[PDB]
Design a protein around this ligand. Structure first.
Ligand SMILES: C1CN(CC2CCOCC2)CCN1
Length: 460
């Protein structure tokens, strides 16, 4: 029975509007409706992993698990195993997997973050799940961010609080937040970003939707505009949107958008918006391909339509050699040449690096770099040829070239990370000096750059 080198992952996000679902929701799991939809010929082919995010979910965990499992069984005739379920208030995440994956899945983590203070603490936040699938780390975040057209800044703050404080993945990766802990990170939910056009344009917007002319609407979508100005979701991807806005519908039809201000909306307009989204971030040069991104047309119990996205994702096997794990392989080494960090910080402390990777027995601390002034004000931290030689646990190129090195630059004074990034070992050549580069972030905001050269020795 060979270990897979690809799996398919289903991501679902649905704000259920505090209403039970209808008796049939199979269209969701089948990626059928509007947008980038799945070929009919694939309908019986199960995804390897189904991750279901709900918001405003009125069901017990038991009630929803029964509906989900019975839905997948009707579609595929496969009885899926429950990997994890985690609920914060009415925000829920369910991970189901094919039974053949039960012994490939380990290190299952769940967490939640509550966003806001006092007034704004009580129903918004995120839940998440992580685990290993053989040699590949997977993370999944379902967030319900602050509502309202005039609160995009609050949403961006919610995002930063969730990525700082959601405790998923390998706790030994202490300088790194969830945006660096996983081979593949999927972040979805009712992100609540709106189409930011004048209220008076509501009927014009509806007209455009009926014509399936989304271009002039997406150019005003707050998530796309905020992403373009690097205010939120820096270094995350989203598939092109080719489905109608998923909010706000009259219930029991999809023929009408309910946008007008009502006591029930706190006298706020809800212009048709793409509230319900799926984004991802994968380590550099790892295969990840979106194969569907769309909304259902036939599930109408909520004022939101369900959104689906499916992905092909590269995975690696749990590698054993004669040597590692449990020793080094002297035939392998990672050298860094002519490296320097460029930092936006106005501080003057000394900095050192930490190298973290599951190809090392444990993380490696460098010597302090040498601080110089950049020609445009910047701090440049030079490491020269001083950086340690990294000693991987396995030298086999079929293992090593699939690995990644996480880099933190830390203050000698405080031991706090000023920047985090990631370098792929999927090089064009071994035993050859090649350029490397990573942006550096902290709390998911750009704080600098790391660049230099790498020289990788494998057993071949
Ligand atoms: C793909 C997407 N890119 C920028 C997007 C920002 C928001 O709107 C769409 C473009 C980041 C890197 N490459």
């Amino acid at each position: 029975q060979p270990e897979p080198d690809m799996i398919t992952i289903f991501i679902g996000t649905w704000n259920m509007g505090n209403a039970p679902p209808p008796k049939k929701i199979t269209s969701w799991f089948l990626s059928k409706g509007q947008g980038k939809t799945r070929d009919d010929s694939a309908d019986y082919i199960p995804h390897d992993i189904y991750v279901i995010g709900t918001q405003e979910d009125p069901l017990s965990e038991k009630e929803w698990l029964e509906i989900l499992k019975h839905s997948l069984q009707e579609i595929t005739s496969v009885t899926f195993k429950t990997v994890a379920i985690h609920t914060l208030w009415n925000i829920r995440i369910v991970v189901l997997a094919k039974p053949e994956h039960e012994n490939r899945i380990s290190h299952i983590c769940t967490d939640n973050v509550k966003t806001g203070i006092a007034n704004t603490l009580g129903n918004k936040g995120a839940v998440g799940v992580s685990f290993m699938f053989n040699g590949t780390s997977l993370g999944f975040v379902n967030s319900h961010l602050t509502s309202g057209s005039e609160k995009k800044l609050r949403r961006n703050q919610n995002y930063m609080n969730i990525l700082r404080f959601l405790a998923l993945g390998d706790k030994k990766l202490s300088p790194f937040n969830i945006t660096h802990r996983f081979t593949h990170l999927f972040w979805f939910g009712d992100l609540n970003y709106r189409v930011d056009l004048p209220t008076w344009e509501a009927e014009t917007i509806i007209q455009k939707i009926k014509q399936q002319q989304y271009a002039d609407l997406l150019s005003h979508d707050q998530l796309l505009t905020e992403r373009r100005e690097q205010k939120v979701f820096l270094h995350f991807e989203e598939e092109e949107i080719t489905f109608a806005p998923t909010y706000r519908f009259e219930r029991l039809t999809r023929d009408k958008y309910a946008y007008t201000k009502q006591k029930a909306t706190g006298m706020k307009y809800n212009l048709p918006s793409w509230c319900d989204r799926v984004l991802w971030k994968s380590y550099p040069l790892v295969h990840v391909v979106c194969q569907s991104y769309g909304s259902t047309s036939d599930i109408m119990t909520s004022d939101h339509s369900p959104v689906f996205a499916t992905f092909e994702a590269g995975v690696t096997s749990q590698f054993v050699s004669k040597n590692g794990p449990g020793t080094v392989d002297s035939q392998g080494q990672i050298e860094f040449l002519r490296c320097y960090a460029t930092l936006k910080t106005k501080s003057q402390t000394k900095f050192y690096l930490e190298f973290h990777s599951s190809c090392l027995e444990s993380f490696v601390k460098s010597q302090e770099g040498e601080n110089e002034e950049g020609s445009e004000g910047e701090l440049v931290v030079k490491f020269g040829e001083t950086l340690p030689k990294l000693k991987p646990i396995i030298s086999d190129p079929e293992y090593l070239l699939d690995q990644h090195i996480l880099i933190s630059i830390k203050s000698s004074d405080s031991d706090e990370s000023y920047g985090e990034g990631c370098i792929a070992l999927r090089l064009e050549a071994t035993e050859t000096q090649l350029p490397i580069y990573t942006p550096l972030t902290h709390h998911g905001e750009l704080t600098g750059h790391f660049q230099g050269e790498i020289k990788l020795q494998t057993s071949q």
